[PDB]
Structures are given as C-alpha cells and as structure tokens.
Design a protein around this nucleic acid. Structure first.
Lengths: 283, 115, 500, 98, 235, 49
RNA sequence: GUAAGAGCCUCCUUGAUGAUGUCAUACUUAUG
RNA sequence: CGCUUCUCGGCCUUUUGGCUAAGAUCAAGUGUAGUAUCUGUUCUUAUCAGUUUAAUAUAUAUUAA
C-alpha cells in the first residue's frame, strides 16, 4: 500500500506548473493580439495534420466565439471545403452556422448539403430541424420531394407523415401515406394506414384498402398481415360476417396454417367474442 | 420492427445504433416536446401556394425575430441535453493512475478482464 | 525520390504494409465506427511485431476474428519478408562478401532467433510425448551397457570423500583452469565481476567453497535458467552458453572430479578422442604408421580390400531424453552426479528478450559434456563394432590393447575390420574385405539397393581436391564400396539416433 | 503551367528514342486475330499431357536392421506454404546450425 | 536477501516496466541483479504461481510423474501446473522423507519514490525542455508584452515588432480574412441585408471588457472541488 | 465488432499505470502441447526391471 | 567537448505562521 | 395516483501515433563548490477616535440639539 500510495502522492505532485491567468482582456487591442497569437497556434495545430478533426472543431468553437461571423465563416468554410465525405462534420458546421443570428446562410447551407451527399441521416435530420425552425409548408414540400426522390424510408417516412399530419390537416398526409405505403408495401404500413384511418373516422376506404392491399400482398400466406387487419376492423365494427370470412380464409392458409399461435389466438379471440360456449366452438 | 403509432410513453433505446438512433429519438423527442402553434393565423397567411411540393419560391420573408428566438430556444435545449453525459463518480481506492489515459486503460482493462 | 534501398527498403515495406492494411481494415466492417479503426493499427501492428518476433501467440480476447485473421495472414507474409531475405543474407554472408558489422551480425542474430524458435519448436512439440523412445533399442542398449561395463570391470565411485591432497590439488587446479580461461580484465560487466569475487572467495576459503559445492551439487537441484549465444563464424552457428558463476565453479569441481577420477580409474577405449597429446602427430603417426604397420595393408595380391570410413558425429544434443543419462550415467558414474548433471541440461534457454525452455538437449558446454559425449560415442561405438571387435580392442584386463594393435596378428584376424576410432566429433575406420565377404555383403546390399545398374555418388564419393588427378575414376568395386558404406549404416543402424 | 522548367538532372537524358514495333516473326496482330491458339494449345497440352513417363561378423552385432525401406517419407519435390522449416529451411538451418 | 521492499518495488517496476525489461528494475533495485530479479520475480513475485497450500489429491500425480521424470524437473514443472521447481523438488523430498520415516531502507525508499516519479517523468528531456520553453516563453512574453503595454499606455512613440517576413506565427497571418474563405450563394441571388444583419449581430457578440475565457481550467478546478468535498457525513 | 485494448508487448513509455492485466498475456501462456505418452513410462519400467 | 535558434550593430466575493549550524546519503562541472 | 421543480443513485460511448540487431549495451578509483530531511526558544490582534443630522457660502468654513 505504501508503493501505490507513494505513486499517488508522487503522481499528484508530478503536475507541471499551474496556469498563469493574469491580465485577462486588458490594454485594449492587446487582447486582439493575444487572440492573434491563439489563432496562430490553432492555425499551426490545424497545419500539423490536414486530417485533424478535433483541432478543426476547437477552431470552430473558439472561432464562432471570438471571430464573430466573418472569420468564423472562414473556419467553417475552410474546414467544410476541405471535407467532402464524413458529412457528420458538415452537420457540426451546419449546427455552428445554425446558432448564428442569420440562419439564412445556414438554411441555404442545409439545402447545399441536400444537393450534397444526403447520407439519409443528416438530410432527413437536418431537414426536420429546418422545417421545425420555419417554412412548414415549404420544408415539408422539399423534404417530401427529396424523400420521394432517392429511395423510400421507414421511421423517417412515417415520422414525416406523422409530423405533416399533426401540423395542419391529414388530407394530404393520407395521400402521401398511400404513396409511401404503395412504394414499399408491408404489414406494418397497412397497420399504420389502418390505425390513422381508424382515428380518421371513415373506414370505408380503410376496409376497401385493407382488402385490396391484402389481395395485392398475398404470396404464400396472410398470417399477421390480413388476419390482424381483419380482426381490427372486425372487432372495431362488430361484424360477424367479416369474422367468419376471416376464419374461413385463415383455415385455407398453407405452411401449417402459417403461424401456429397467431391464427390460434386470433381464432380463439374471434371465436370467444362472437359465440364460443359449447357445441361448434367446443369441437 | 414497429413502424408508427399515435401515443407517447417511456422506452429504453440508448443502444449501439448511436447516430441514427439518437437522431431519430432526438427528432421524435423534439417534435413531441413542441406542440402545435398559431398556424391557423398562418392559415390566414396560407393562400393559394401551399401544396405542389416542388416549390416556386422557397424563401419569401421567413417570419420575424420571434421565430428567431423560438428557433434559438431548442438550440440551447439541445446544448443543455448535450451537456449531460456522465458524472464525476470518483473516490480513493486501489492504486493510482496517470491523467485520463490510465483511467481509460483501466476501463478497457476491466472490459477485457470480464468476458 | 524514395526507395533508397540499404535498410530503408524495409521501412517502406512496413509503411506500405500498414497502408493497404488500413484500407482493408476500413473495408472489413460495413459500418462499425470511424475512430475505432485507427486504434486497431496499434494493436494489430504491435501484436504482429511481438507475435512473429517472439514465441507468444499474441491472442487478443474478444478480438475481431476476421480482422485478426487478415492481419495474421499479412503478418505471416511480413514474416516471410524477414525469412527469405534472411536466407539471402546468410548466403551473402558465408558465400557472399560480408558488409560492415550491423547488417551482418544483425541478420546472423535474426537467424539465431529462428534457430532458437526451431529448437524450441521441436523441443516443446516433438519432445513432449513421443520423442522416438524406441523401447526395444533402449533395452538393447541397456544390455549393451550391461555386458559392456561387465566385461570392462570399472568402478562407479560417485565422489571422492576428500581422500588425499589430490582432491584439494584438483580443486586448486580446477579453480586455476576456470580462472585461467575466464581471467581477463577489460570493461565487461557484473558477469566477470561475479567471477572475480567467486575466484577470490574460492581461493580464500578452499574448504568452505569445496564443501559448499559438494553439498550444493550433491543436494540442491539445478540453478536458475542460464543463457546462450551463437556467433557468426562462417560455420554452423557458434554454439555457446552463458552460465552462472555458481554452476561454473560447480562445473570446475565436477569436471575435475569425473576427469581426474576417470583418469585414476582409467576408463576409456584405446581408440578415442585426444587425451594428453597433440592431435596432428597422434592421428599422423597413429593412422599413418599403424596403417602402414598392418600385415598386407598396402600389398594385396587378390581378394583383399581395405575400407577407410571417416564419419563425423551428428546432433550431440539429439538424445532429447534424460533417461539415457539416468540409467547409463547413473549406474556408470553416480546417482547424484547424473542427477544434478541431467538437471543442468533442463535449464531454460534465454536469448535476448525471448525465453525458450528446452530440456531435450544438453548445454553447448558443461563440466561432464566431454565425458558425456565420450560415453555416448563410446557405447554407440561398440554398437557397430560389437562385443567381438570391441573385445579384441579391449585386450587383457591388466594391460589393455595398444592403439594400433592388440595381440600379435590376431587383432586383424579376429576383427574383419582392421581398425577404427572416434576423435571428438569426427571418426575413422579401416577394414579388410574378403572377395567372398565383399561379394556376399555386396550381393545383400546390392539386393537392398533398388536399381539394376545406375549408381549415383551414394554414401561415399567425390574425393578431388588434394589428389586431383591421382584419385580413382570409378569401378565396380567402388560401387561395392558404396554397398560397404550401406553395410556400415546397416551394421550400426540405431533405431532412433543421430546417424551418419 | 508554362513554368517549372529550369535545370535538368541525370537519368533524364534522351533514351530509347526509337521504339520497337512488333515484328511478323514474333507476334503479328492479324495472325493473332486469325490465330488457331485455342486448338493449338489444346493440341500442345494434348501432347505434353499425352506423353509423360520418366557371416559371424554380422551375427556378432547386438542390433539388426533398423532403418530400411524408408525413402519417399521425405518428399523429393514439395512446395510448402510455411516458410518456417518445410524442406528448404530444414536443410538450411541444419547446415547453418550444428 | 530479497526483502519486502525489494518485492514491492519489484512489483511496481514490473507494472510500469513489464517482463520484457530486466536490467531496468535491476538499476532501480540498486545492488540487485537483472538475472536475480527475473529469476526471483518469475519464480516468486509472479502472481501466476500459486504459493498457497497445495492439493493432496492432485499431488499424487506428481509422484508417479516423478517416477517417470527423474531429473528433468523443468520439463515436469508446467505439467504439475504449480511450477516452482524448487518447491516441487522440496515437496518430493518431504514426501520421500515422510514415506521413509514410517539507513539503507530509507535510501531504497527514496530511490523507489524517485523511480516511480521518474516513471511518471517518462515524457523525457525533450518534453521537459518543451515545458521549460513554454513556461519561459510565456513569462518572457508576459514581461515583454507587460512593459510594452506599460510604454504604449503612456507614450505614443513605438516601433513595430521585428522583421515582418514570416515570423513565429502563421506566415503573413493577421487574422482578417486569414486563409481562403471561398464564398457561398443561396439561389441565383445576392443577399445583402441578411449579411448586414449577420455582421451587426457579429459586432454585437464581441464586446470590450475584462475576463478570461478558458475550458480545461474550470474543469480541473471543478474536479478538485468535487474531490475535496462531495458528500462525506460518513454513516 | 470493436477495438480491444493493447497491453504487454514492448514500448509503453506512455500510460505507465498498469493495474495488472498486462502479464495475463493470452490463456495460460501455452498448453500441454503433445502432453505425454506411454513410451517414456514403459521405457522407465524397462529401466527399472 | 557542439550541431541549432534570438534582438539591440461609469460599480465587487468562501481567511491554515517566522530568524540562531555541523555528519551516512542523492544530483550537477571541459581543474586529475 | 398523474404533472412540474429540486436532491441522491445506476448503465452506454470518454482513443498508448513508425521500423531494423531485447533497436545496442550496463557501477561504483580519489578530489572542490552548491542544493536536498529532522530537534530542546516565543503567541495574537476585533483597535487609532476627531458622531451624527439639517441649512447657507466657495472637500473646507460658520450656525442650531
């Protein structure tokens, strides 16, 4: 214990010098000369390694701090001009320009990043930040055109349709949800459109779209796809004909009735709901 | 997995996906943290150019310094949320170390020892 | 203007090796992390450095098995870059012209580390379980030592119990021999300083150090692991060992014991290594004069032949088992002397920062190593000869036979082989072959030789340098002489041993 | 640019000012276009792969024949990926260490 | 001798050094030798060896091994798993006998403390001269800029620095438009009032006053204040 | 996929603090390799008899 | 024992002491 | 029980820059100057006092309790 403790005391006394913070911001332009020496040290540190991330980030923080706009925009513009890939750094510089009081060149710079590599990360995230900042109808329009241009999405598309739906009206978000769901059909998209259409009242186009979507997506067996929607609209509207048709179509499913417990718990749910008791439901 | 729904509740997350996950949960927490607004009055400011995604004019007048401060508030909120990472959580035990690098080597050494 | 060759080409090969390894390492994980790939160059780089440069496998727990397997592949390629180039360096050293010092002794030391990893590789790998025991030939050799020491009738006196002043004279003579060979004063280090302090303390108290070494070796086990070295002599390595001063003085009293008492007991074949003489006149007048003194040696009308076979030794450490020294050395000399002696051969080898423990072979040098190899080649020398030829070379028990003759002309009569000897590593042989005997064995080895006609250089051939134009071209009897070399191989034919 | 031409150095002197076109004896591009090399190589490998072809002294010994009939145990021609020993470094280390 | 101080200092020297180094600890252990330090360390001070008791059921296999072993102790030491060839031979001797029966300390402590402090000093004489050059350069700049500020505050007569070509800073750098800033345009237009407002708020951000802007200083002071008092109260 | 630490080996002039874990190396620093066979035991019994 | 560098030819802060000289020992010198 | 604020606790991320032959080796001759640990001697002051307030004249002077 005396060896480790002695190493703790000697290590604690091994620090080299305290700071000498004297004459802080004094003698008028002398502070600007100290800022010129510090900016020179940062320029030499960024000069030692052209691939340096850290030093560039510190030059961006100290820049935006003491360099106001011009020289700060020169640091973010030089580092941004020296960085093509690794768009996360472009998101750091975009966040530094977003904190400025202008924000016009920050939004236009966000559009320049949209024309740049989208990465499907900083484009949707930065687009959501700009749209949340201002330009509701415009930001959702360019974000919907961009997201509708290169590839579809899942959490970004569903979250974009949710934010566009809660914004003002769900009318346009219904057609956009039908186009996005039609671009990448799946059971989750049918359940989402059936849930939003369920909270939308209606349900005529939700049931017709449920049968039409269940018919076009049929390949091997329905299982959690059609039976979940048939039970949702069934138990929602309390229709025995839809429960009997769903139970009849579920019995025709291949691959050992598709999922065992799924169709069993669903047939027991609609069974117990509709009639149950003995006789038929017992056999 | 789960696509979308209408609800707000607690979750777990905080997992390896990192950037994409923290940005999705950060945008969802930011959107759910900010409710709707006066856009009905902007519904008077609404007229004929709304739909037709491809835009004729993407700039116009913006809004005002109002939306500038209201835009600066979530920036400071994201700065305060970014300022939360871990705590000091220190003590005097076992042997000594040298600055940060020895503590990082102690954490990685503890990660390699337990397997 | 890069690639200056010299030693700079290796640095560019290592940097370029770490270059493509960074691109492939970045292409190993589809997403992963960015900064996490930069630190992997240090773990894989240094892990390959100490990995290939040392005997440690350098296995990382929870490592990226695909990346560790790729860096292990390219790491083995880097080892090949230090392998074939080292083979070209050894060719450019011995055969080629030497260049300065650094590069020369450097590559010689890398090749020495390769020989250490090879000797430790066969040591640990092959020496763990099955190292060519051959219990049949081991029992046959046990009977060969049984009847051999029986008819020899020597005594295995374990240690002198301080009988007379000759023991003290052997201690002062051994200390004067170790101090004489080890005595020089320039620079050096605590090695020669501990040898000087042990020399002054040894000469100061001869009885204290004598009893301390006697009870030491006769009681305590082997000392700490010693070192070794191999210089570049333009020869095969340069076998050498660095031993502690305690085992050095114990080796002085030991070697003085087995040596001295061995001379008092007078246990040694008449044909053997040099003893108290000069090799050039010994082999000169012995082989030349005794060969010329043989009956009808150089004069043979017909049917008579002479076979002179000079065969060096091979792999003095090939024993690989301490049981031969246990039984053989123990019953031949002592239980404690062979105990600690065989324990000294189990010391772990240490070269530079690498430590390779090999107990198979013995040290490059030691106290009884002389008598060790003398008993090895002495027992194995009677394997080819046999109790007949060795019984003829023995002679009367009172006065044994001479070097070049035994009794009258019965030496060559009862021994179809004229003579033979083993001098240090080398050996010589002389025989008289009868036309019926050389035809018989020529037909046996001829049937054992798988070819009707064509005969290559085989065992013995290509004697040129000194009698360039005076040598023999070839003959059918020369092919019969190669079949006679096969008759010497099969004549000895040890199951598991280092052979000609 | 229109600059950076000042002084020369060695190895930059005029060299190989006249190139060498392919002669009709070595390689002709038209002959390679009309070449039969598919069937010519099929027939070449067809020929090469077609033909490949090519006593009291002895009783007094306490031992007997030990190593006999063991030859091919050491492969004459073997290419080993391991450069540590194999065939090469076995005799190389055997000759350089003894 | 192999005292406890040499064992602790040898363990710390093995932690900050490693098994690869030998004569380093020997130089730190004064009269001790590298061969004795490696032999005694690997034989005893190495935690890999188990010196605590033994297993009577597992020790029976070492006897039959010893029957197949004799001599060849170093070859059978890893086979036993406990190593310690001296302890193995001593245990075999005890089993055979049982079967047959039926000032300098303070100087070494100061050298060890200076050895560990030297281990934390591994930065070297290059980093030491860099630290002395940084503190001496900061003191010379504080004194030169000090007296220069005292002279500039009184009299208006002063020369300008030194030779203007290059310098101890970035070449030509006087941080107004330092390094290429390129340029940015939004869409087919020249934004004027926006850049003027960004420059107005830019001039509003910078203000004249007295203060010191730092980062690691407040973090180190906060770590010292947290280490001094946090909760305590015992119980 | 992750980057483990690096210890032991050589150099290590920086970060001299080593809460062990460096001397652990990998596994048990080797294994029984070829272990042992009955040849040495049978030869030892033949030497005893 | 010595390669390199530098310049002069208009407004604030958390309260732990000191002066009478000598040995074993550690480090720094081209004077031995 | 829900929401807001404050206090304490737990987890994720927190990062040793190259190579060849351990890269190469290992002890104290004396001599001058300087620096480097530790011991028997003492112990306190919150005071100086020439207050305050109001009015007038140019911090000072005068008048009124």
């Amino acid at each position: 214990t005396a060896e480790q403790l002695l190493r703790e005391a000697k290590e604690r006394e091994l620090e080299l010098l305290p700071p000498p913070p004297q004459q802080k911001i004094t003698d008028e332009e002398e502070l600007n000369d100290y800022k010129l020496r510090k900016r020179k040290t940062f320029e030499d540190n960024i000069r030692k390694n052209r691939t340096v991330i850290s030093n560039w980030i510190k030059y961006a923080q100290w820049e935006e701090s003491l360099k106001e706009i011009q020289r700060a925009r020169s640091i973010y513009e030089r580092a941004l001009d020296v960085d093509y890939r690794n768009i996360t750094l472009w998101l750091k510089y975009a966040e530094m320009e977003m904190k400025n009081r202008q924000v016009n060149h920050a939004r236009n710079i966000w559009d320049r990043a949209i024309t740049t590599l989208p990465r499907v990360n900083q484009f949707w995230y930065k687009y959501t930040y700009m749209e949340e900042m201002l330009g509701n109808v415009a930001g959702a329009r360019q974000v919907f055109e961009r997201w509708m241009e290169w590839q579809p999405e899942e959490q970004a598309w569903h979250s974009y349709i949710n934010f566009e739906l809660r914004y003002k009206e769900v009318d346009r978000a219904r057609t956009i949800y039908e186009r996005f769901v039609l671009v990448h059909p799946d059971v989750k998209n049918w359940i989402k459109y059936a849930r939003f259409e369920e909270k939308h009242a209606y349900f005529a186009h939700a049931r017709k779209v449920y049968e039409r979507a269940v018919e076009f997506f049929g390949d091997e067996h329905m299982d959690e796809h059609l039976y979940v929607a048939f039970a949702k609209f069934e138990e929602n509207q309390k229709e025995f004909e839809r429960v009997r048709v769903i139970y009849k179509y579920a019995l025709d499913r291949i691959s050992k009735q598709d999922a065992q417990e799924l169709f069993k718990n669903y047939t027991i749910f609609e069974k117990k709901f509709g009639d149950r008791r003995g006789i038929e439901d017992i056999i | 997995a789960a696509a979308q729904l209408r609800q707000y509740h607690r979750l777990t997350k905080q997992i390896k996906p990192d950037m994409e996950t923290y940005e999705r949960l950060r945008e969802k927490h930011g959107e759910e943290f900010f409710p709707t607004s006066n856009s009905l009055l902007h519904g008077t400011h609404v007229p004929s150019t709304e739909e037709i995604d491809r835009m004729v004019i993407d700039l116009e007048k913006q809004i005002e310094k109002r939306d500038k401060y209201s835009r600066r508030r979530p920036y400071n909120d994201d700065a305060d949320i970014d300022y939360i990472n871990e705590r000091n959580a220190k003590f005097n035990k076992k042997a000594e170390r040298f600055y940060g690098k020895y503590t990082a080597e102690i954490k990685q050494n503890l990660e390699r020892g337990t397997a | 203007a890069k690639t200056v060759t010299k030693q700079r080409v290796e640095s560019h090969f290592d940097l370029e090796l770490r270059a493509a390894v960074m691109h492939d390492i970045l292409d190993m994980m589809p997403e992963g992390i960015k900064q996490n790939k930069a630190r992997t160059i240090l773990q894989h780089l240094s892990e390959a450095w100490r990995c290939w440069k040392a005997n440690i496998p350098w296995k990382v727990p929870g490592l990226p098995t695909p990346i560790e397997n790729m860096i292990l592949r390219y790491v083995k390629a880097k080892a090949d870059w230090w392998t074939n180039t080292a083979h070209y360096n050894r060719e450019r050293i011995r055969r080629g012209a030497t260049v300065d010092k650094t590069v020369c002794k450097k590559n010689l030391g890398r090749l020495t580390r390769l020989y250490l990893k090879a000797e430790q590789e066969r040591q640990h790998n092959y020496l763990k379980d099955g190292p060519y025991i051959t219990a049949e030939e081991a029992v046959a050799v046990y009977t060969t030592t049984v009847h051999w020491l029986e008819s020899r009738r020597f005594s295995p006196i374990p240690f002198p119990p301080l009988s007379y002043k000759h023991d003290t004279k052997l201690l002062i003579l051994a200390l004067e021999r170790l101090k004489e060979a080890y005595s020089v004063k320039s620079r050096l280090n605590q090695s020669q300083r501990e040898e000087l302090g042990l020399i002054e303390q040894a000469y100061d108290n001869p009885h204290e150090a004598l009893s301390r070494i006697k009870r030491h070796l006769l009681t305590q086990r082997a000392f700490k692991e010693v070192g070794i070295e191999f210089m570049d002599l333009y020869s095969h390595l340069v076998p050498v060992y660095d031993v502690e001063p305690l085992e050095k003085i114990t080796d002085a009293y030991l070697d003085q014991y087995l040596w001295y008492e061995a001379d008092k007991r007078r246990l040694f074949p008449p044909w053997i290594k040099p003893a108290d003489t000069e090799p050039p006149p010994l082999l000169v007048y012995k082989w030349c004069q005794g060969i010329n003194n043989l009956q009808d040696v150089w004069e043979t009308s017909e049917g008579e032949c002479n076979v002179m076979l000079e065969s060096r030794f091979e792999k003095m450490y090939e024993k690989i088992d301490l049981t031969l020294l246990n039984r053989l050395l123990r019953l031949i000399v002592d239980h404690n002397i062979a105990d600690y002696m065989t324990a000294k051969n189990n010391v772990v080898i240490n070269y530079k920062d690498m430590n390779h423990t090999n107990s198979y072979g013995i040290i490059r040098g030691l106290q009884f190593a002389s008598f060790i190899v003398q008993y090895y080649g002495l027992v194995m020398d009677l394997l080819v000869l046999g109790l007949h030829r060795a019984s003829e070379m023995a002679g009367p028990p009172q006065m044994p036979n001479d070097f070049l003759s035994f009794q009258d002309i019965a030496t060559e009569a009862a021994h179809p082989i004229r003579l033979f000897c083993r001098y240090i590593d080398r050996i010589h042989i002389f025989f008289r072959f009868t036309a019926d005997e050389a035809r018989d064995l020529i037909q046996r080895y001829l049937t054992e030789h798988p070819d009707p006609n064509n005969e290559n250089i085989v065992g013995y051939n290509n004697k040129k340098c000194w009698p360039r134009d005076a040598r023999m071209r070839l003959m059918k009897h020369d092919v019969n002489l190669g079949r006679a070399v096969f008759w010497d191989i099969k004549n000895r034919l040890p199951r598991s041993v280092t052979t000609v | 640019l229109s600059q950076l031409s000042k002084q020369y150095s060695s190895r930059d002197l005029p060299s190989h000012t006249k190139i060498k076109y392919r002669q009709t004896t070595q390689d002709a591009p038209e002959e390679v276009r009309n070449r039969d090399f598919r069937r010519e190589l099929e027939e070449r490998e067809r020929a090469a792969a077609r033909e490949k072809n090519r006593r009291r002294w002895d009783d007094d010994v306490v031992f007997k024949n030990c190593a006999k009939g063991v030859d091919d145990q050491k492969k004459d021609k073997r290419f080993v990926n391991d450069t540590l020993r194999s065939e090469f470094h076995k005799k190389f280390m055997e000759k350089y260490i003894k | 001798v192999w005292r406890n101080t040499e064992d602790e200092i040898l363990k710390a020297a093995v932690m900050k050094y490693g098994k690869n180094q030998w004569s380093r600890i020997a130089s730190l252990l004064h009269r001790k030798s590298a061969k004795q330090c490696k032999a005694r360390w690997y034989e005893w001070l190495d935690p890999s060896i188990k010196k605590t008791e033994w297993s009577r059921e597992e020790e029976e296999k070492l006897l039959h091994l010893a029957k197949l072993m004799p001599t060849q102790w170093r070859t059978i030491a890893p086979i036993i798993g406990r190593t310690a060839a001296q302890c193995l031979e001593h245990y075999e001797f005890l089993l055979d006998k049982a079967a047959q029966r039926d000032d300098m300390d303070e100087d070494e402590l100061e050298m060890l403390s200076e050895a560990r402090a030297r281990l934390a000093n591994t930065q070297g004489k290059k980093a030491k001269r860099k630290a002395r050059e940084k503190q001496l350069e900061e003191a010379r700049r504080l004194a030169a800029l000090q007296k220069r500020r005292e002279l500039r505050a009184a009299g208006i007569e002063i020369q300008k620095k030194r030779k203007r070509k290059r310098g101890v800073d970035y070449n030509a750098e006087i941080p107004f438009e330092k390094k290429p800033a390129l340029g940015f345009y939004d869409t087919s237009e020249e934004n004027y009032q926006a850049l003027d407002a960004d420059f107005r708020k830019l001039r509003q951000q910078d203000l004249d006053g007295e203060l010191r802007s730092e980062k690691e200083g407040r973090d180190r002071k906060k770590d010292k204040q947290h280490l001094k008092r946090k909760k305590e109260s015992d119980l | 996929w992750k980057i483990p630490p690096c210890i032991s080996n050589w150099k290590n002039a920086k970060g001299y603090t080593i809460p062990l874990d460096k001397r652990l190396a990998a596994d048990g620093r080797g294994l029984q390799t070829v272990h042992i066979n009955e040849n040495f035991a049978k030869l030892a019994e033949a030497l005893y008899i």
